[PDB]
Structure formats: structure tokens, C-alpha cells
Design a protein around this ligand. Structure first.
Ligand code: FAD
Ligand code: NDP
Length: 518
């Protein structure tokens, strides 16, 4: 009797969840977040070089036409402080904070089968009740780097990229970075010119393409805002929602000289998804096609990195091109006299002293600062860190013991009245379009519940297994069977448009696979 819905999360997913349910469906709803301000991961992740993978004019909401026309499009891609300022504007305009309880982590969510609602308890023993639970948790857990003996003995600055403190200075300091993923590449490229010396501890070299983050002219921004309606229709009609001309052309169907200029054109425009999916249509499907994309980036590495032994060290061994990163000058950094690259697969880290990282060759790497760009736990980690218990009292820890399974990426069997926003078993595409799709869909169902006097919604065990069927069927058709994440399937790989088709069919067929109770 407290609320119609409780929302966990104050980022992209939770913000739109609260706006949709409160202002478009007149529900009484409260949102909770451990943060002190809106933003989600854009409020937490403030490491150097933090940048969006998707272009500025698309990494935003589409449901507010006035916001689209007044939005600031400063550069082709948007930095973390600017995303945070955008989400704070969204909360300002739509009067959202008055229904968000900040500095409040939820500890447990217990489904009350008798009354058909959720018992939600914060970490300060505050207990709320609500008919529906909206979980917009994102992806977060941060595996710091234990496994390395003696990391707790380090006397210098030790930061994980997810907990990046304020007022970090780099001048005159010897800095080390562990991790060469998307975050590591961004930090390394941003700080190398600022430090006295940078040591990169690379376990696995990955492919990276230029992002081409350039300033946007008054004319560039005007052409976007004049054609914004068509731009978003292309997003809903695409597989990735990145504004790309998604290619159908086979990689080997063109000559070697034509293939080189197609890759070169995308290399100049910039963009990771552009290089994989705007160039040709079978790079993630055919091995001969994939190797062609590998050899182009491998050739680009050996031209940029003048030292052939450093270039060889940066070249991915046998890793096939599956999600290459984007960078703003990552390969050029290793030409600097103050940058050292350490292959910690052939020369592993064995211990950390009070003042250094020591490798297996005995070399002590003196450091004033050690940055851990080591990553984040699995996508179900944010859910397992919650004490959620549905029917018969089973917890999501037990139910997802062997990975996350769901119906349409939004519903979990044995967990009624719980709807996941940007959760696992979802599509691989631009996140704001995915979040908007799922939030509009979930709100449509809850409105269908208030109209039809329904107080319990639950997915069946077989609709979930049917979802695992279509995800595994599409996934096993693509090259994503070597170094990724994902018989539990983690992602639906049919694209955004087919995901919206799939989810529209069951909303048009009386929510097939859902157990509606009155
Ligand atoms: C630097 C960066 C750049 C990215 N760029 C792109 C891009 O270009 N394109 C793209 O498609 N994706 C991108 N992503 C990924 C994706 O867009 C983000 O994960 C996205 O912000 C997800 O939004 P969200 O609201 O669902 O989750 P989040 O933004 O992570 O918000 C989740 C919130 O829930 C809160 N929360 C969780 N559990 C609890 C609890 N128990 N109690 C209280 N609060 C809780 C957290 O504190 C957090 O504030 C990027 C991610 C990062 C980190
Ligand atoms: N817009 C963007 O481009 C961004 C996207 N993201 C998203 O966030 C997710 C996380 O990105 P990231 O933060 O890079 O997390 P990642 O897991 O992608 O990067 C992990 C890095 O840490 C290294 N590592 C982990 N453990 C060790 C160890 N014990 N010793 C040495 N090296 C180690 C890994 O090496 P190995 O590979 O050998 O395990 C890898 O290089 C990505 O999936 C990405 O999609 C986040 C920020 C920016």
C-alpha cells in the first residue's frame, strides 16, 4: 500500500522508468539509488577518458522531442561530465528527484505471495511495499585486483577505474595501468602525455579502431536536429541503433583493392561498430571475412607503432575480431619515450611491493600510482548482490546459479511482478534505445494490469527456456564462440528491430508465456 512500483536504479534505465510510470500512467512510485545524484554509471565512472561508444546525438533519450532540439551536441561523442549534465537536465525538466530516494541502497526484496506484492528493505532497515519491482541495476561489481600477491602492501596511490577519486594529479609520477580493455585504452590514451612514465601491463592485446571524436560545427548539429525524426526511425529499424548504414555486402564478394578502401573509409570515419558492421555484413559470421578485418587492423598497428617489436606486442595473437574497442590515439601512445609495454602473459605479475609491481622476470617496476582497469563482474552480479526472493522463497543466487535466464530479457520465472530494465538476455545494441523499448513495454503491461484487475504477473519456466532457445540459435550462428561472454546465453543477438518485433508479438497475443492472475 506504499507504492504501485519500486524502482531500483537512478541511471538511464531508472530515470525513464520513473517518468513513464508516474507521469504517463499516473502510478505512485519511488526510486532508490546509493548515489547522491542521478546518472547511474555516469555518476560513478569518472575515470580519465571516459567516453560513449555511440555518437552524442544518439546516446540520449528519444521520447522528448523538446529535449532533442535543445540538446548540446559538442563533439561527435559525449564525455562523462556531459552525459551526467544531460541526465541531470532530464531530472530537472521532468521533476524527477522528488520521487527518488538518494544515498539509499536496497538490501533485500521479498515477494509476498499472500498479498501479491514485494517487501523491499533498504540497508538502513527501512521497509517499503509495492505491487511491482522495476530493477534498473546496470552492470557493476568491480573485481579489484587480488590474485596478485601483496597488492594490499602498495603504499602509493591505488585506484580502480570504477572508484576514480577526485583531484588525481599525474605530473612527475610513475604510473602503471593493468588492463587493456575499453576502459584501460581510454585511461591510457588520456594520461600518457601527463605522467613522467607509464607502464602498461597487458595480459591480452585487443583490436582497437579510431573513434574520430571531432568537434561538431553549428552546421553539423543543425543537420541532425532538422532530420531527428528520420534519424530515430532508422534507429528503430536497425539492428544496432548506432545510426550506421548496416551492410549486407559479403566481405569476400569484392576485390582486394575495393575491400581495402572500404575498411579504410570506415577507419577514417571512426567507430568500432562502424568498422565491423558498416563495412560488410558477414564479419561476425564468416571466418575468412573476420580474418580480413583482423589483417587490416594488424596492418594499421604496424604502421602507427614504429618499433616493430612494440607493434608485435600490441598485435592480438589469435583472438578473432569480436567487438574491437574504440580509441582516440591509443596506438600512437606507444611511440612515446615515456611509455613501456609489459606482456604480462609471457611475463606475469607475481607480487606487488610497497613501491612497485614485480613481474615473473624479477624486474621491479617502480610506481607512484597503479590504476586497475581490471573490469567488472558478470552482468548478473548486480542482481546476485541483491537478496531477492520470489515464490517458495528461492533467491536469485540459487535460481541463477548457472548464469542468468529470462523471458525477453525482462522477466524471471519464480519472481513475479519484477521487471528488469537493461538486464541480461537482452539485445546487443545501443543501450538508450534498448532501455526505452523495455520501459515502454513494461509500462504497457502494468497498464494492462490495472485495466484488467490483475495483481500478479509471472513468466513460465518454458517461456524462459523458449527465450534461451532463440538466443542460443541466433548466437551459435555467429562467430561469437571465441572470447566474449556468450548453455546459458547472455545476449539476444537478433538486433534491436527484431527484438522489438519479438516483444511486440507477445504483447499482441495476450502476453503469451505470462501467468496473469486476478
Ligand atoms: C564509460 C561508459 C560508456 C558507455 N558507452 C556506451 C555507449 O556508447 N553505448 C551503449 O550502448 N552503451 C554504453 N555503455 C553501457 C551502457 O550504456 C550503460 O551500462 C548504461 O548507462 C546503463 O544504464 P542503466 O541505468 O541501466 O545502469 P546504470 O547507469 O549503471 O545505473 C544503475 C544504477 O543502479 C544503482 N543500484 C544498483 N543496485 C542498487 C541497489 N541495491 N540499491 C541502490 N541502488 C542500486 C547503481 O548505484 C546505479 O546508479 C557505456 C558504459 C560506460 C561505463
Ligand atoms: N564506450 C566504451 O568503449 C566503454 C565501454 N565499456 C563497457 O564496459 C565493459 C568493461 O570494460 P573494461 O572496464 O575494459 O572491463 P574489461 O573486462 O573489458 O577490461 C578488462 C581488462 O582487465 C584485464 N585483466 C583482468 N584481470 C587481470 C589480471 N588479473 N591480470 C592482468 N590483467 C587483467 C583483462 O585482460 P584479459 O582480457 O586478459 O582478461 C582486460 O584487458 C566492457 O564490456 C565495455 O563494453 C566501459 C567503458 C568504456
Amino acid at each position: 500500500m506504499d507504492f504501485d512500483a519500486i524502482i531500483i536504479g537512478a541511471g538511464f534505465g531508472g530515470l525513464y522508468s520513473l517518468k513513464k510510470l508516474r507521469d504517463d500512467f499516473n502510478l505512485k512510485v519511488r526510486a532508490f539509488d546509493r548515489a547522491t545524484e542521478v546518472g547511474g554509471t555516469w555518476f560513478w565512472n569518472q575515470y580519465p577518458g571516459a567516453l560513449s561508444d555511440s555518437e552524442t546525438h544518439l546516446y540520449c533519450y528519444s521520447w522528448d522531442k523538446e529535449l532533442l532540439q535543445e540538446m548540446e551536441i559538442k563533439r561527435k561523442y559525449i564525455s562523462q561530465p556531459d552525459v551526467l549534465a544531460y541526465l541531470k537536465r532530464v531530472a530537472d525538466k521532468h521533476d524527477l528527484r522528488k520521487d527518488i530516494q538518494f544515498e539509499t541502497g536496497i538490501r533485500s526484496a521479498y515477494f509476498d505471495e499472500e498479498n501479491s506484492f514485494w517487501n523491499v528493505t533498504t540497508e538502513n532497515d527501512e521497509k517499503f511495499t509495492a505491487r511491482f519491482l522495476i530493477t534498473a541495476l546496470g552492470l557493476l561489481a568491480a573485481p579489484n585486483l587480488p590474485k596478485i600477491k601483496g597488492i594490499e602492501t602498495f603504499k602509493g596511490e591505488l585506484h580502480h577505474t570504477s572508484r576514480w577519486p577526485k583531484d588525481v594529479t599525474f605530473s612527475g609520477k610513475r604510473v602503471g595501468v593493468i588492463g587493456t580493455g575499453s576502459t584501460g585504452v581510454q585511461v591510457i590514451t588520456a594520461i600518457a602525455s601527463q605522467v613522467k612514465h607509464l607502464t602498461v601491463f597487458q595480459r591480452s592485446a585487443q583490436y582497437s579502431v579510431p573513434i574520430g571524436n571531432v568537434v561538431m560545427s553549428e552546421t553539423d548539429v543543425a543537420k541532425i536536429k532538422e532530420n531527428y525524426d528520420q534519424i530515430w526511425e532508422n534507429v528503430w529499424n536497425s539492428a544496432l541503433g548506432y545510426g550506421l548504414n548496416e551492410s549486407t555486402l559479403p566481405t569476400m564478394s569484392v576485390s582486394a583493392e575495393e575491400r581495402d578502401k572500404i575498411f579504410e573509409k570506415a577507419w577514417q570515419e571512426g567507430g568500432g561498430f562502424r568498422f565491423m558492421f558498416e563495412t560488410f555484413g558477414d564479419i561476425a559470421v564468416d571466418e575468412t571475412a573476420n580474418i580480413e578485418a583482423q589483417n587490416f587492423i594488424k596492418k594499421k598497428i604496424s604502421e602507427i607503432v614504429k618499433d616493430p617489436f612494440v607493434a608485435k606486442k600490441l598485435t592480438p595473437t589469435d583472438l578473432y575480431a569480436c567487438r574491437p574497442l574504440c580509441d582516440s590515439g591509443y596506438y600512437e601512445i606507444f611511440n612515446r619515450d615515456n611509455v613501456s609495454l609489459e606482456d604480462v602473459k609471457a611475463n606475469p605479475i607475481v607480487e606487488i611491493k610497497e613501491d612497485c609491481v614485480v613481474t615473473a622476470d624479477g624486474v621491479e617496476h617502480k610506481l607512484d600510482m597503479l590504476i586497475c582497469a581490471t573490469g567488472f563482474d558478470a552482468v548478473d552480479g548486480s542482481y546476485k548482490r541483491i537478496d531477492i526472493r520470489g515464490k517458495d522463497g528461492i533467491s536469485i543466487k540459487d535460481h541463477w546459479k548457472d548464469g542468468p535466464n529470462s523471458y525477453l530479457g525482462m522477466m524471471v520465472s519464480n519472481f513475479p511482478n519484477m521487471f528488469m530494465v537493461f538486464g541480461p538476455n537482452g539485445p546487443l545494441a545501443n543501450s538508450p534505445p534498448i532501455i526505452e523499448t523495455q520501459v515502454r513495454w513494461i509500462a504497457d503491461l502494468i497498464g494492462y494490469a490495472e485495466d484488467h484487475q490483475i495483481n500478479q504477473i509471472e513468466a513460465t519456466k518454458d517461456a524462459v527456456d523458449n527465450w534461451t532457445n532463440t538466443c542460443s540459435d541466433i548466437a551459435n550462428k555467429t562467430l561469437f564462440a571465441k572470447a566474449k561472454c556468450r548453455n546459458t546465453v547472455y545476449l539476444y543477438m537478433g538486433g534491436l528491430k527484431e527484438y522489438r518485433n519479438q516483444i511486440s508479438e507477445v504483447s499482441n497475443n495476450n502476453y503469451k508465456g505470462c501467468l496473469l492472475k486476478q
